[PDB]
Amino acid sequence: SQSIIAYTMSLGAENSVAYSNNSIAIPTNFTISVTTEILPV
Amino acid sequence: SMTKTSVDCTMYICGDSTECSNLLLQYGSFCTQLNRALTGIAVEQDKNTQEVFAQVKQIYKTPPIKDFGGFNFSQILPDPSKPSKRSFIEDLLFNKVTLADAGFIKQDLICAQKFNGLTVLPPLLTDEMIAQYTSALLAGTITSGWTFGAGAALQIPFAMQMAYRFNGIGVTQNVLYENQKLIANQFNSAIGKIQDSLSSTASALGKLQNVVNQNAQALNTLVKQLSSNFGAISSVLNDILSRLDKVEAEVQIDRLITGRLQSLQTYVTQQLIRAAEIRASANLAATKMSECVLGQSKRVDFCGKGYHLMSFPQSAPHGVVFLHVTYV
Amino acid sequence: ANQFNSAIGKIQDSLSSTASALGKLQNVVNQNAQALNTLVKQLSSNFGAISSVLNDILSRLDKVEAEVQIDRLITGRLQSLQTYVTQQLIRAAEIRASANLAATKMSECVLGQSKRVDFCGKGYHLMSFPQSAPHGVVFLHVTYVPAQEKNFTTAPAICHDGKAHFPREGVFVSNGTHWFVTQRNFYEPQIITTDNTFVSGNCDVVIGIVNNTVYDPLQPELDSFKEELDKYFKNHTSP
Amino acid sequence: DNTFVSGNCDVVIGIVNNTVYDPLQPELDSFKEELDKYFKNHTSP
Lengths: 41, 328, 239, 45
Ligand SMILES: *[C@@H]1O[C@H](CO)[C@@H](O[C@@H]2O[C@H](CO)[C@@H](O[C@H]3O[C@H](CO)[C@@H](O)[C@H](O)[C@@H]3O)[C@H](O)[C@H]2NC(C)=O)[C@H](O)[C@H]1NC(C)=O
Ligand SMILES: *[C@@H]1O[C@H](CO)[C@@H](O[C@@H]2O[C@H](CO)[C@@H](O[C@H]3O[C@H](CO)[C@@H](O)[C@H](O)[C@@H]3O)[C@H](O)[C@H]2NC(C)=O)[C@H](O)[C@H]1NC(C)=O
Ligand SMILES: *[C@@H]1O[C@H](CO)[C@@H](O[C@@H]2O[C@H](CO)[C@@H](O[C@H]3O[C@H](CO)[C@@H](O)[C@H](O)[C@@H]3O)[C@H](O)[C@H]2NC(C)=O)[C@H](O)[C@H]1NC(C)=O
Ligand SMILES: *[C@@H]1O[C@H](CO[C@@H]2O[C@@H](C)[C@@H](O)[C@@H](O)[C@@H]2O)[C@@H](O[C@@H]2O[C@H](CO)[C@@H](O)[C@H](O)[C@H]2NC(C)=O)[C@H](O)[C@H]1NC(C)=O
Ligand SMILES: *[C@@H]1O[C@H](CO)[C@@H](O[C@@H]2O[C@H](CO)[C@@H](O)[C@H](O)[C@H]2NC(C)=O)[C@H](O)[C@H]1NC(C)=O
Ligand SMILES: *[C@@H]1O[C@H](CO)[C@@H](O[C@@H]2O[C@H](CO)[C@@H](O)[C@H](O)[C@H]2NC(C)=O)[C@H](O)[C@H]1NC(C)=O
Ligand SMILES: *[C@@H]1O[C@H](CO)[C@@H](O[C@@H]2O[C@H](CO)[C@@H](O)[C@H](O)[C@H]2NC(C)=O)[C@H](O)[C@H]1NC(C)=O
Ligand SMILES: *[C@@H]1O[C@H](CO)[C@@H](O[C@@H]2O[C@H](CO)[C@@H](O)[C@H](O)[C@H]2NC(C)=O)[C@H](O)[C@H]1NC(C)=O
Ligand SMILES: *[C@@H]1O[C@H](CO)[C@@H](O)[C@H](O)[C@H]1NC(C)=O
Ligand SMILES: *[C@@H]1O[C@H](CO)[C@@H](O)[C@H](O)[C@H]1NC(C)=O
Ligand SMILES: *[C@@H]1O[C@H](CO)[C@@H](O)[C@H](O)[C@H]1NC(C)=O
Ligand SMILES: *[C@@H]1O[C@H](CO)[C@@H](O)[C@H](O)[C@H]1NC(C)=O
Prior knowledge:
The structure is cut from a larger assembly and holds four copies of chain A.
Chain A: E1 13-16, E2 23-27, E3 30-40
The structure holds a molecule of 3 linked components (NAG-NAG-MAN) (3 copies), a molecule of 3 linked components (NAG-NAG-FUC), a molecule of 2 linked components (NAG-NAG) (4 copies) and 2-acetamido-2-deoxy-beta-D-glucopyranose (NAG) (4 copies).
Residues 182, 185-186 of chain B line the site of a molecule of 2 linked components (NAG-NAG).
Protein name (chain C): Spike protein S2'
Region (Heptad repeat 1) (chain C): 1-47
Coiled coil (chain C): 26-70
């Protein structure tokens, strides 16, 4: 029941921002994240 | 990016001839190597287009109530009514570059290339999809400032974002507040001068057009080289195979194989060297997206001339246009 | 520290679990290996000579026959080296560009801290650690990322005794009942004071300015010092 | 509040005189006039 599907790609999740002339969001907390990046030399 | 080109080395050197194909196998991997080289170029066009525009894995959207403190982004935000959702300034950009084959099916220089085993492959991302990624970048910029770069998008009022910017160039945030009508008017008026420039002069997009013109000029040159004799009794392969038996035809066809194969090595070398120019430019545009759009840069003259405030990306035929906003 | 220690753990587990991550370095090693094999396989091609084996020409033909066949192999072979060296020069330009970028990230992410957004990993750059790899470099970029946000009401400036006030650093916010001042990248609210803020102009010009009392940390330090003094005068009724 | 101190007037090339205002000053000296009239009044009973 598996098969090759073909589709027009989505570019990401749709996300309207909570914008308003007097609204702000501020982070109460944070994460330290470590990301590997690799370059040929 | 530049137009993806696929050439079939065998269809170009040996148009429908078994004899020429059997002689071409005497060279071995030369035909495959030149398709590997052009495939490495064709694939890194989609990479370059991803590096520049696909900087956010989420499609931000502007609110319906445009209360951006008096700043009027309506000429750089999407248009709902136009069949492709590009902005007003993006439509001017799409009119002001001319293309030699877009690759979108056939049913003239485009025709002459296709009749000779030369093909243009379509980009992965459509011009609607680059308009959507540009909408996400611009709507994140207007509604969230740098914060959508550093993590989740945080809303901030647009005049309050511009205040953080001003502190960023060492001008105190009340210099915005006390002048906000003037600063919004100057911005609105400068977005006006972008149109009154691009609408009227031909040369402004010249960097993009020159990139298209070279890929066109080189495909035209590779089409023309099929008319070279290279010392054979004809430039046309069938006229040799018609007038000679195998024992004399092989001597003539071997000249044309040698000359056409040297012509492809020239095209593929010119295209690989050119492809390095475009990759350096894509890395520059991805860096300018990261540092001028998703942020504010303290790097002098990196994000347009003057003290950088913010910048807005726009889609363009095979390119990007940055509208840099600077305090002078 | 615990988040950092755990994230370094997730690097170990990532590089254990996934196949594709080194796919840049692996693709560079494959490209030069495949090119060298292409260069050796191109020796077996005839180029129209009666064999690709050099001695099968030199024996089975006379001198002025053989020279016409050997010159095909010399021509084709020389073109094979010119092709490999052209592919290697063009390749070397990409590795150079990548080495100059790596030397720039060593300079700016390892020897420093970058204010260039998304240059040294995604998020706000804290620091980076280099690791050696076959023909390459790996950076572990460490970044601060904003996590749990709350919405707040905000204002451009605050009004008190008819003058406007603005934050020295940070932004004003309200939880719905009280105004606070806080740093723009982490929620730590404070009572709004004359030490957190500076003054400019009367209350009319600022679009969106609200009304909220500002505290003066010199004031109750003088006003309690009026009651002490006030107590003196009461004592001084008695002697 | 706008300025910070370091060293004395001899070392800096091209330094100039001007007065430097202190905002604590009339905020204390008004609190001396607020005091002086109270001492004068408290002679009267
Ligand atoms: C907005 O933030 C304000 C500051 O945290 C908060 O006001 C504070 O509310 C608490 C009660 O939840 C008060 O705490 C005191 O309450 C009585 C006072 O007699 C005592 O029994 C307690 O032990 C304690 O001392 C704070 O006094 C009060 N602070 C102020 C400045 O009024 C608001 O409740 C927050 N508003 C919203 C909508 O969340
Ligand atoms: C923030 O606080 C301000 C000070 O209380 C307040 O200003 C005051 O606003 C009222 C209403 O507009 C004015 O009332 C007077 O209006 C005219 C004179 O201008 C008279 O005809 C009326 O009879 C009445 O006396 C106050 O004069 C005015 N105060 C000052 C110093 O101008 C703001 O309106 C407050 N804003 C908010 C959003 O609360
Ligand atoms: C800036 O203002 C300064 C304060 O008024 C002023 O400094 C004063 O300069 C005079 C003249 O040089 C000195 O006069 C005394 O000098 C020595 C003792 O140090 C004696 O031999 C003299 O007879 C005389 O008493 C003042 O002592 C000196 N005051 C201080 C506090 O250093 C500057 O001259 C002014 N400069 C300018 C350019 O405006
Ligand atoms: C920040 O608030 C927005 C919406 O504004 C609020 O709307 C009221 C219900 C009330 O909460 C007011 O204080 C605000 O003015 C949030 O956006 C909504 O998110 C939910 C999903 O969580 C979604 O179903 C709604 O459709 C969204 N509405 C809009 C207009 O976008 C936003 O999620 C809040 N931020 C956080 C961190 O929760
Ligand atoms: C900030 O977020 C971190 C997680 O990213 C929270 O830390 C966790 O807290 C829960 C309890 O609430 C514990 O069970 C976990 O073990 C904690 N993890 C770590 C790494 O310590 C933290 O509580 C949050 N801080 C605030 C102030 O909300
Ligand atoms: C933002 O600028 C645009 C362009 O000037 C404004 O759009 C015009 O609005 C007037 C008045 O309704 C119309 O007569 C024009 O025909 C509109 N032109 C276009 C291109 O739509 C827009 O109104 C401005 N926004 C604000 C908030 O003032
Ligand atoms: C594929 O080819 C067919 C023709 O063989 C095209 O079909 C024609 O389309 C036009 C325009 O819509 C119609 O006027 C004709 O009547 C169609 N002819 C037939 C025989 O159906 C079709 O448009 C082509 N599709 C693409 C994407 O090129
Ligand atoms: C700062 O310069 C701006 C122009 O960029 C001045 O604004 C203009 O002022 C004149 C009157 O002096 C008006 O006729 C124009 O319409 C204004 N232009 C705009 C875009 O609003 C402004 O007056 C100057 N400000 C100061 C304090 O000198
Ligand atoms: C903010 O927008 C609301 C409508 O949503 C409006 O009532 C209010 O006057 C606006 N305030 C400012 C400062 O723009
Ligand atoms: C009142 O002042 C006198 C000194 O004049 C001092 O001895 C006494 O302790 C003071 N008492 C009080 C209650 O202040
Ligand atoms: C500036 O230099 C000149 C000499 O070139 C000198 O006469 C003058 O007093 C100096 N002024 C200041 C403020 O240093
Ligand atoms: C003088 O002192 C008395 C208290 O003894 C007080 O009632 C009165 O208001 C004061 N008058 C003035 C003018 O200070």
